[PDB]
């Protein structure tokens, strides 16, 4: 039994009073993590190599994930059961070093750690054949699934409230990885294709996106005792909404009161992303991100997002460091052309296992200052039946309402544990 | 710390579209399971030998069970807390070999693996004295509890809806096991007795069954590198409805909208079951089942079930095999005399941790075909207050409605992992 | 990976019929717990020392807790994510022997085992610095959080029902432990200060306690192969209601229908407690408790509690003992001056892992007798909206109702396990 995982927990305060506020720009899909995580998250993996004969082996792996509010000792919660898979390694005699796998799995996820952002991720129930040698790189193929909570009807209608039956979406990939291009630099290329999957006689809404494509190209360059990753992704239609490689094809979303409304995913997403971590001399490590994400949809409800962040670390002695994180977001509405923006400055003293920017457990004591200006938000006034602008981007002062977090600053402070193992 | 358990997970499709359909005959209590499990299910057990001195020890064991629908990554669910027991070996000097135990435990469950069917199983919160030597065999004695969600009233009434207080049931066993009866064959005999248990002044409905008996005789014969188990079980009254060891004595069941309704369970069950697994030379194995089950109740709502299945395995290499499963169900209604019937043909290719038909993990790729014809179903139209036929077996065409899955066929295909460790 | 925890589970009966009932005096905050636990409870901790260099290390710890009814095998439940923290030992250069920590944690909890009563407990989300050596003793410092489910309003109002927003409470610890004092004795002194913490513009109800103090002094004396603990605690205002070190500054509670009601906790608590465990020879051990707790509130709804209990254990042979527990509770109502009382006598035969009264795993077979006499209870008739006496102590016969459990007596029996590892 092999024990691995990730956990974060802590205690924080807000300068105006109360418990810790979390700062995320309205219309942005992520937040600069340092001193800006307001939840206790823990995911626990119990694995084992359960059989081995020479080079051939079977590995078993699980994951149970807990999310709680960090407000009380006794916090009851639904645990999320996220993995349960068997991996058969080097087991197909005419394909050396391949892994055959089936079950529920985190499958080759790619993230930007300082903003907590998975940019490519098709994790789920699935099966596949991974790490096929083609003599110049590695080829991996899987089939995986997600579902939309409704969006399908058992009869043809023009009323959206009939479309309440669950919609399975299947994703099929090809990943071609580890291609040597330049000395010290590698290329990874992926194509993910997704589609809604319907039982016979079942029907999606008219104009539903229904299927869609995602194309990923990543260059990874070894540099300065660390690396630079440069990522370009293009996606169409049913892959736009998630924007990570899981498909949503119905175009239907659900209210709290269980009314159904249209969110239609036709159009395209362009993502251009640079990130990495480097060491400068021996006393400084620095982690960084720059991203442009453009979502263009035929219903005009898309967003255009710029994110720029740097995280320099200074090392005083091997186990003790000072970390600063400076980030700036700009989010433009397609619908109105207005702009929401935020900058966050976090300064923290950190004790950690080993001397690296990546090495953890880490114990942090921090102070965060955040200044935002938001001039548009999403209309969620009333409910979907009541409101024709439900789920749509609108100005801050729209119709005498208040949308977005307006213009204000705030500052938070506290202490945090973070570990992976 | 000792890590043991069971898990199954996968991904599948249906030939007419959508996610994997699961095929079970209306009125049958089990399903032929190769390529016909649609659930991600895992049981995770953490044990330890906490104290050991000489021949004596205290073993501690737990079980946490997760069931999710295998449609997304983030699947939140209630975990079922199924075990937490302490087992004390050789602590009674004058009963050597014996185990005393108390707490929540899976106590000596007996199943047929290819249909996922427990035929003897009194598992629950309990306590007992296990594996006493009587010189010619082994004797084990326990007491366990189950409950029924209502069925008890605190006052004298003739109204069914007043019987909403929970009904505790006590189960007490005598298991006399491992007796040599012929060369290479052993006999096990069981008597399980159970009753409803009421708080003072409380009561069940007039004509409630209240208490009941289960009598089990099992012969285990070693043949052809495996075994044949031949099982005869007779049960009466409160034991009939649950059908495998736990008393249900109230006779009252509950609607979705929380209307109580009288089912009753007076009468008898006869189960005759033959099953096992054998090896037919080096390259061939087979597991097999034949079962007759007769449930006869004074309210006419019983069922008469015939089921028969075979599962040949062919070995190509020590770790790669082809599995065929052929199963047939026929279920006759006591109430109408009509018959529901289904046959299933599944062909699968699998990779497995060693040569044996019992070797796990196994990673499968499968294709399943199922043909059914159903002429009776259970009436669940409306609710118990507005429908007098609620929970009763009715013809397929009853009132011009549709009951049971009619006359149809379908096929499914996919990939699956099955593991115990 | 290190696997540790606590668990208890069993099966029992009541002499008048049914499952096992649990006996606790109306207005008492604990129950004499040998043969008087009706819950399957398990806490499962997975720890690991994940980095070690010289004296220094980082230790990671977890706790997930399950509490289920012990009525069936399949008991679904919300697990409580109680704890998840990292502890950095010997990291700080000029504070040798000190530990820094952050996350959800069980922090310095002191209990009386025979009544299951934590008398000092500030556990929760937090962070701290502990075991700072000051040469004559050790200093420990922490900050932890607890949160009330409502009690805060975002606008100015005199309406109690407008106070529905959560109220964060922050607790600040100073513990000075391990003082030399006398041959074979030692002393710990603690001061905990707690306060409600509000988001800007928000408010609590008029006259709400808002902040408060706990003052703890504990002397521990080594005596007769075991120990005595003598505890004096005094608390004021917001610390009184929880009574163990977590402030509740709102003064607001909620009924099932979600009507807010005022339970104001201004005033003071005095607790005097004596407990311990000793060996009176080779074959005789005993555990004991005596306590006086007086809660005096300005709304007259406090309670005045006397309790005393002894638990002698006779050892026949090293693994088998006979345990008796005799306890007496008396609770006086501040509001009425009436008295509720109970005496419980439990006799049990125990097998346990070793020859100490603290040795567990333990398997117990028991019989418990209890008589109670109750002259007052709490009014929970109707809702907080329609009953002006809601949540308040009233005579047993109030308006011809029945409040408290009257005069009665009963006996329970069965078997249970209790383990820690």
Numbering used by the authors:
A (entry chain C), B (entry chain A), C (entry chain B): 1 to 421
Sentences copied from the publication:
Here, we tested a new tool to drive density fitting with molecular dynamics simulations, in the context of a new structure of the membrane protein maltoporin. Specifically, we collected and processed cryo-EM data for the E. coli membrane protein maltoporin, and we used a previously reported x-ray structure as a starting model to refine against the cryo-EM density in various environments. We present a protocol for using density-guided molecular dynamics simulations to automatically refine atomistic models into membrane protein cryo-EM maps. Membrane proteins are particularly important targets in pharmacology and bioengineering but present distinctive challenges to data quality and modeling.
Using adaptive force density-guided simulations as implemented in the GROMACS molecular dynamics package, we show how automated model refinement of a membrane protein is achieved without the need to manually tune the fitting force ad hoc. The proposed protocol was used to refine models into a new cryo-EM density of the membrane protein maltoporin, either in a lipid bilayer or detergent micelle, and we found that results do not substantially differ from fitting in solution. Fitted structures satisfied classical model-quality metrics and improved the quality and the model-to-map correlation of the x-ray starting structure. Fitting performed well in detergent, lipids, or solution, offering simpler options for fully automated simulation protocols. We also present selection criteria to choose the best-fit model that balances stereochemistry and goodness of fit. Additionally, the density-guided fitting in combination with generalized orientation-dependent all-atom potential was used to correct the pixel-size estimation of the experimental cryo-EM density map. In addition to identifying a robust parameter set and model-quality metrics for refinement of membrane proteins, we report an improved estimation of the pixel size of cryo-EM data based on goodness of fit and stereochemistry of simulated models.
